[PDB]
C-alpha cells in the first residue's frame, strides 16, 4: 500500500502495536559473540543491545578492537551510517578513535546528557574553547572551536588532533536537544528541519566516511533518524515514489543492527516524518 493512506488505515484501526510486533517477529537474528566476551562488559551500556559480529566497527588496535557500534550500509539509497551507543566513562577515547579511523565528518547526538534524572551518556566533548580534552588511552586531542545554540538544536565545530601524527580535522557536532523525556514529538517539523541541516553540511555525503549517530542505546531515536533519511532519498531516486515501503526499509536496516525503532510510537512518528518530509522536498 501507499504510505499516507496505510497510515490513516492503521490510525483508524488502532493497530500500531500489531504492526510493530510483526516487524519484531520478522527481524534478523545474527550472532554478537564479540560483544558478549567477559573482557567487554564495561564497554556495553545495556546487556540486551549489542552489535552483530558481521557488521560491527573494529577499532584499529591489536589489544582490544571492540566498540558497541554498527555499520548500516544501504545499497540502493547509496548511504551509510554508523549507529552507536552514547559513550561511557571508559569508552570516550574509543569513540573519538572510531571517528578518526572511519574518516567521519559529522556526529549526530539525539539525547541530552541527563534525562529522567539519570545519566544517559558521558560528557564527551569540551564545553569551553579554552578547556580542551585529551584522551590519553587513544592519543587524541579535542578542542571546541565554535558553538551555535538554536531553539531546537545546537551545532558545534570541533577540532580533532591525532597526537601521534599531528594531523588535524574539523568535525561537526549536530545536537538535537528537544526530544521529550517520554514519548515522541507531537510534530515532526523540528526533527525534519534538523535532518536537513545535517544534510546541508556535507556530513552524509560520499566524499566523507559515514556519519556517526547516537542516542543512549543507539537503536531508538537513532533508528528514526536513518530510517527517515533513507526513505526520503529513495522517494527522490525512484520513478514511482509511492513504491517506497517503510516497513521493508526498516527490516533491511535491522539486518545490520538489532532493535531499530524501540516502540510503536517511534514507528508511527517515523511514518509521520517521511510523509511530511516528502511534501516539503517538492517539488514544494
Ligand atoms: C501503546 O499505545 C500505543 C498504541 N497505539 S495503537 C492503539 O495501536 O494505535 C497507538 C500508537 C501510539 C502509542 O503511543 C504510545 C499508543 C497509541
UniProtKB/Swiss-Prot annotation:
Q: Describe PTMs of this protein.
A: Oxidized on Cys-215; the Cys-SOH formed in response to redox signaling reacts with the alpha-amido of the following residue to form a sulfenamide cross-link, triggering a conformational change that inhibits substrate binding and activity. The active site can be restored by reduction. Ser-50 is the major site of phosphorylation as compared to Ser-242 and Ser-243. Activated by phosphorylation at Ser-50.
Q: Could you give a single Gene Ontology term from the biological process aspect?
A: negative regulation of MAP kinase activity
Q: Which residues carry this modification: Cysteine sulfenic acid (-SOH)?
A: 215
Q: Which residues does this entry mark as bearing N-acetylmethionine?
A: 1
Per the record, membrane topology reads:
Peripheral membrane protein
| One cellular component term from this protein's GO annotations in UniProt | endosome lumen
The record's tissue-specificity note reads: Expressed in keratinocytes (at protein level).
- Phosphotyrosine is found on 20, 66
- Modified positions (Cysteine persulfide) are 215
Q: Enumerate the UniProt keywords alphabetically.
A: Acetylation, Endoplasmic reticulum, Hydrolase, Membrane, Oxidation, Phosphoprotein, Protein phosphatase, S-nitrosylation
Residues in domain Tyrosine-protein phosphatase?
A: 3-277
Q: Which residues bind substrate?
A: 181, 215-221, 262
**Residue numbers of Cysteine sulfinic acid (-SO2H) PTMs:** 215
Q: Which residues carry this modification: Phosphoserine?
A: 50, 242-243
Q: What is its EC number?
A: 3.1.3.48
Q: What is the effect of changing residue 181 to A?
A: Substrate-trapping mutant
Positions of the catalytic residues? 215
Q: Which reaction does it catalyse?
A: O-phospho-L-tyrosyl-[protein] + H2O = L-tyrosyl-[protein] + phosphate
**Subcellular location per the Swiss-Prot or TrEMBL entry:** Endoplasmic reticulum membrane
The UniProt transmembrane annotation reads: none
Quaternary state and interactors: Interacts with EPHA3 (phosphorylated); dephosphorylates EPHA3 and may regulate its trafficking and function. Interacts with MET. Interacts with NCK1.
**What is the purpose of this protein?**
Tyrosine-protein phosphatase which acts as a regulator of endoplasmic reticulum unfolded protein response. Mediates dephosphorylation of EIF2AK3/PERK; inactivating the protein kinase activity of EIF2AK3/PERK. May play an important role in CKII- and p60c-src-induced signal transduction cascades. May regulate the EFNA5-EPHA3 signaling pathway which modulates cell reorganization and cell-cell repulsion. May also regulate the hepatocyte growth factor receptor signaling pathway through dephosphorylation of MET.
What is the protein name for this chain? Answer: Tyrosine-protein phosphatase non-receptor type 1
Q: What is the lineage of its organism?
A: Eukaryota, Metazoa, Chordata, Craniata, Vertebrata
Q: Which gene encodes it?
A: PTPN1
Q: Which residues of the full protein are shown?
A: 1 to 284 of 435
